[PDB]
Structure formats: C-alpha cells, structure tokens
Amino acid sequence: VERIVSRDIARGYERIPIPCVNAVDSEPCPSNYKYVSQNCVTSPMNIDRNITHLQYCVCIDDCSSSNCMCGQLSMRCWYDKDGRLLPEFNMAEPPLIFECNHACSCWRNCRNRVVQNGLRARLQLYRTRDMGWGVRSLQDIPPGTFVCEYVGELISDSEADVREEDSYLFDLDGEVYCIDARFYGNVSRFINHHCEPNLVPVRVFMAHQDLRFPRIAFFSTRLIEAGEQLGFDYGERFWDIKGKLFSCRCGSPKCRHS
Amino acid sequence: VERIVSRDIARGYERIPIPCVNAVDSEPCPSNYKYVSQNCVTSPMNIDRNITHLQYCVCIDDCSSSNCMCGQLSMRCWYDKDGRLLPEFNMAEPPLIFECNHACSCWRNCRNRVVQNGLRARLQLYRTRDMGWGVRSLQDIPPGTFVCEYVGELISDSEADVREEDSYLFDLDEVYCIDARFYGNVSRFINHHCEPNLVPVRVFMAHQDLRFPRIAFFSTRLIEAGEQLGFDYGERFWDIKGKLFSCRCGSPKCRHS
Numbered sequence A: 001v002e003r004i005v006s007r008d009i010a011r012g013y014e015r016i017p018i019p020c021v022n023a024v025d026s027e028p029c030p031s032n033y034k035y036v037s038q039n040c041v042t043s044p045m046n047i048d049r050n051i052t053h054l055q056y057c058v059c060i061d062d063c064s065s066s067n068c069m070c071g072q073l074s075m076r077c078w079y080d081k082d083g084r085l086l087p088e089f090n091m092a093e094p095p096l097i098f099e100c101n102h103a104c105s106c107w108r109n110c111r112n113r114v115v116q117n118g119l120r121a122r123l124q125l126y127r128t129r130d131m132g133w134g135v136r137s138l139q140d141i142p143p144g145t146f147v148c149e150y151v152g153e154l155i156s157d158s159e160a161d162v163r164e165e166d167s168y169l170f171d172l173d174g175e176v177y178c179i180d181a182r183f184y185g186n187v188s189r190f191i192n193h194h195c196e197p198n199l200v201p202v203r204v205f206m207a208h209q210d211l212r213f214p215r216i217a218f219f220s221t222r223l224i225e226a227g228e229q230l231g232f233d234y235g236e237r238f239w240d241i242k243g244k245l246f247s248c249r250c251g252s253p254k255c256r257h258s
Numbered sequence B: 001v002e003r004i005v006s007r008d009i010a011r012g013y014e015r016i017p018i019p020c021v022n023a024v025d026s027e028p029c030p031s032n033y034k035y036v037s038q039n040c041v042t043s044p045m046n047i048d049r050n051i052t053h054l055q056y057c058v059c060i061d062d063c064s065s066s067n068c069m070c071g072q073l074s075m076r077c078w079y080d081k082d083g084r085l086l087p088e089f090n091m092a093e094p095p096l097i098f099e100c101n102h103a104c105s106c107w108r109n110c111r112n113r114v115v116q117n118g119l120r121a122r123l124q125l126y127r128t129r130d131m132g133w134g135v136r137s138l139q140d141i142p143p144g145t146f147v148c149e150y151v152g153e154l155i156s157d158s159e160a161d162v163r164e165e166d167s168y169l170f171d172l173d174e175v176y177c178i179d180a181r182f183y184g185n186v187s188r189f190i191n192h193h194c195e196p197n198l199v200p201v202r203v204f205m206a207h208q209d210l211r212f213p214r215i216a217f218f219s220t221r222l223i224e225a226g227e228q229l230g231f232d233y234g235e236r237f238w239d240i241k242g243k244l245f246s247c248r249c250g251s252p253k254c255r256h257s
C-alpha cells in the first residue's frame, strides 16, 4: 500500500506539484527543512548584480545563429528548439552555459533560455527500501532534458567548515562557495547518489555572470523511464568523507564506492 | 492614421504584450532606454536578503482569516478574493503592504499575494498630442486593482544628487530612489495627473528591507477602457519642473498649472 503523505512538497512554488509517497514504512513527509524553489542566503553573499557587467547579445532573431554572443560565451548554444541539449554536448566534461538575460536584445522566448524557465518534469518524492527518501520521475524524460536545479542556501567554504552536517552540500568549484540544502532546499536535496548517474550537473549563468556563483542544473544523461529513480554522482569529496561511515548502495555493476 | 510601432515593448517579459502605437507624429517606438520587468542596480545595494530576517505567517488556510500574521503587519490584509484592495483602503494615506513570502507556511496561491504575481492589466504605450508618450488601459480596470510597478534602477540619494536627468525619478522615503531613465518598465511612461487614477503603494515581498519598498500602482477608481493612466508625481517634482513648464493634465482642479 502506497500512502500519499503530501500532495506537493513545494506548496505550489513549482510549475507542477511534487507529491510525496511512502510504500515502505510509517515515516511522515520530511519536515525538518524549508522548501525553497530558488537559492537563498542567510549571511550576505556579495553576488555581483551590476547590470552593466552582464555580457549580452544583440540578436534580432531567436538566438539560433552562431553570432549570438551568449552562445559564444557557452562555446556554442547547446539547446535545440525543445530546450534539450544537443547530442554533441560533453556530458563527461560539461562547459559553462550562459543563457540569455535581460540585458540581451532578444525576446524572452529565444532559443537560449531553458534553466531560467524552471522545473517542468513530473517528479515524486518517495521512500526507498534502503536509502531513505529518493526522487523518481513519473514520466519519460528524453536525453539532454533539464530536470531540476540543485537549490539551497549559498554559503562560503569557511561557513561550510563549521557546519556539522555536510550530507546536503554541493561545492561550487581561492574563495570557494557551496550550496547547503540541509536547512533550505528544493527537490534536489532528496536525490541519492548513483555511480552511473542518469543526471549530470551543469554550471549555468542567467540573471548574473558572477563566476563564483554558478547555478547547478541537472540534465538527463539518457532516456529516463517513467518510475526511475533520479541519481547524480556526488563526487570524490563526498565519498572520501562518507566512505568511512558507509558504502555505496547504488547497486550499479560499475559501482565505484561499494 | 494609428501606426503600430511595436507589438510588445517588453519583448515578452510580461504576462501580456505591451504594444506601442502612434497616431500623432513620426516618432518611432522609444529606444533610448532598456526595458526591464523588475528592478535592477548598477552600484551595489546591500538589500538585506537574509531569509531568517523575514517575518512570516503560520496560516493553515489561504491567508483569508483574521489570524494571518502577514496581514497583521498592515493591520489587515487589504486584498479581496479577486486581488483588489478593499473599499476601506485609505487611498489618501496608504499603509505598507507586506505580502506573503517563501518563509510563510501558506501556499503560493494564498490570498496575500498580488503584486508578486506581476503585471496583468492590458496596457498600451501611445503617443499623446502634447505630453510625449503616455500609457493607456485597453480594458476597464475596477477600483483597487494592481496595475503596474514603478520599476527601474535602485540608486542612493547621493547618486540621484549627481544625475542630470531627474524626470524619471521616484523617491522611496539614508534614502533611495528608483531611476527609470536608463532602465525601466512601462511605468516610466506614465504622465502626471493632479486627480490621478493611480496611487503608489509601498509593498514588501521577497525581502523586508524597509529602505527598499517596491512601488505598486493601484487604481483609485474605475478606469475606463482607453483612458490614459496617471499618478501624482508630487511636490518635489513640481517644485523643480514648475520652473521650466506647467502642468498639462487638464484637470479643472489642476494644482500645478
């Protein structure tokens, strides 16, 4: 029996609801954090938002030509007309993506705008048998589709150094910064690690181009089938620390942390 | 002959297009500014965005009850079920409005969220006969409706002190201004009227830094389809510009003619 413990963990802040179900145990919907749909701060982060520091394009079309400066900052625009990454996109070593912004001459519906349009896929928080909560897709997701952003509290490395919990940390890259999704986060905080992951994180710039503060967008690395759990590779720093305490349960025949 | 010089001056950044028409002269659509749908900065404004500094409500409903703590911040929520200001709203002395935010327990579709849902009314930039460009409504607007935000570049009082062009300034109160001269939305084109159909209301949404209210224009009366929008620029504007020109609003009670 699959109980519905929340019809929407986002309380309407996403384009569609993100329900939560539990077919495993009696645990209620998680409530020891606050859902936020965009990154937040406690202590101030001096993100450079001077509008005159944005690089921008002067395109008179839909930004599908090689002359778009935003595509050139991205090496090329990697988006097809449906917002999916081109097959040539390097999933193993992704470039920086510079989406168009409000300084550009183009319209809000131009080709180079995907992550700034926000989560679209139908996701569901659910109780796994042996890895706590996880996130699954309720629909087929084609390859190269934007799935969700890793959203949370932006903090300095020195602030991360003095927090007891580091199990919900994403390192952004001298002065380095982190997204801590422990106390404030979106759906991405519940995604478990997989060693052959169906999501890859991509560093993206949209409303600002402060290179210290990429936003982290997960794109699908393959066709994700309806019902599949999402996963990304937490990376070597997470496992250098947590491997002391537990081993990976992703179950991949190519698992690297078992 | 009414020429359509732009189907949408906002290039798709608003919920609806804002066309521009000219039935008066040769002038093409204005292009000596950059349209933005939300406030921007050049020099940094240290707006307090610490999420733990937000006051918030714990409502278990749609925030239509007497107990919503966000409504209490204005003594009460002033929005009805259609998002319009209650008849008792004091147009002559508007309170500060604190809308719900992401720290509240309520849902994103609660009652206390209007200005944060963005411009909805069907507006049009057009060429007036004797006041340059103006903005008109294409639809009837009932009283108390959110029409548009005064959007532009947030600058300090000392920065405004050294800017030559001051015809697109809105004063917020160590005071700040919105300068819509170089970056602005549709509101930068609204002309002054001495009996205005718009009133500016100070609103707080994603942050509650009292130095930086956002300026939301609400209708003071039923605005008729085709009517030009206007607000009262105030005494500081006319104390300065009265030296150069007189008011052309045409009101029989005009105060700056």
Ligand SMILES: CCCN(C)c1nc(NC2CCN(C)CC2)c2cc(OC)c(OC)cc2n1
Pocket: A157, A158, A160, A161, A162, A163, A164, A166, A167, A169, A170, A171, A176, A178, A234, A235, A237, A238, A239, A241, A242
């Ligand atoms: C530039 C360094 C950024 N910093 C400080 C950091 N620290 C982590 N952990 C601890 C922080 C608290 N101190 C008591 C011990 C170290 C940490 C843990 C991660 O995963 C378990 C992780 O995954 C991606 C990234 C992490 N990043």
Ligand SMILES: CCCN(C)c1nc(NC2CCN(C)CC2)c2cc(OC)c(OC)cc2n1
Pocket: B156, B157, B158, B160, B161, B162, B163, B164, B166, B167, B169, B170, B171, B172, B175, B176, B177, B233, B234, B236, B237, B238, B240, B241
């Ligand atoms: C909080 C900052 C208040 N400040 C500095 C200011 N200055 C204005 N104007 C000038 C700026 C350049 N100096 C040479 C002379 C004064 C000004 C003009 C306005 O409308 C004609 C107005 O309308 C609402 C508001 C204005 N506000």
Ligand SMILES: C[S@@+](CC[C@H](N)C(=O)[O-])C[C@H]1O[C@@H](n2cnc3c(N)ncnc32)[C@H](O)[C@@H]1O
Pocket: A131, A132, A133, A134, A167, A168, A189, A190, A191, A192, A193, A194, A242, A246, A247, A248, A249, A250
């Ligand atoms: C960001 S959380 C994922 C959400 C978590 N499952 C929960 O219930 O809140 C990361 C934590 O989940 C568990 N986890 C995630 N991936 C795992 C994996 N591949 N193997 C074992 N545990 C994993 C570990 O406890 C890890 O510290």
Ligand SMILES: C[S@@+](CC[C@H](N)C(=O)[O-])C[C@H]1O[C@@H](n2cnc3c(N)ncnc32)[C@H](O)[C@@H]1O
Pocket: B131, B132, B133, B134, B167, B168, B188, B189, B190, B191, B192, B193, B241, B245, B246, B247, B248, B249
């Ligand atoms: C913020 S702008 C309004 C848009 C302006 N009509 C334009 O074409 O850009 C303010 C300027 O418009 C003109 N204006 C606005 N209201 C006026 C009024 N009631 N009487 C005379 N001129 C007015 C003045 O030149 C004023 O400095």
Ligand SMILES: [Zn+2]
Pocket: A057, A058, A059, A062, A063, A068, A069, A070, A071, A100, A104, A106, A112
């Ligand atoms: Zn372009």
Ligand SMILES: [Zn+2]
Pocket: A057, A059, A062, A063, A070, A100, A101, A104, A106, A107, A110, A111, A112
């Ligand atoms: Zn573009």
Ligand SMILES: [Zn+2]
Pocket: A056, A057, A058, A063, A068, A069, A070, A099, A100, A101, A104, A105, A106, A112
């Ligand atoms: Zn661009």
Ligand SMILES: [Zn+2]
Pocket: A194, A195, A248, A249, A250, A251, A252, A254, A255, A256, A257, A258
């Ligand atoms: Zn593994």
Ligand SMILES: [Zn+2]
Pocket: B057, B058, B059, B062, B063, B067, B068, B069, B070, B071, B100, B104, B106, B112
């Ligand atoms: Zn409430």
Ligand SMILES: [Zn+2]
Pocket: B056, B057, B058, B063, B069, B070, B099, B100, B101, B104, B105, B106, B112
């Ligand atoms: Zn509230």
Ligand SMILES: [Zn+2]
Pocket: B057, B059, B062, B063, B100, B101, B104, B106, B107, B110, B111, B112
């Ligand atoms: Zn509310």
Ligand SMILES: [Zn+2]
Pocket: B193, B194, B247, B248, B249, B250, B251, B253, B254, B255, B256, B257
């Ligand atoms: Zn007048």
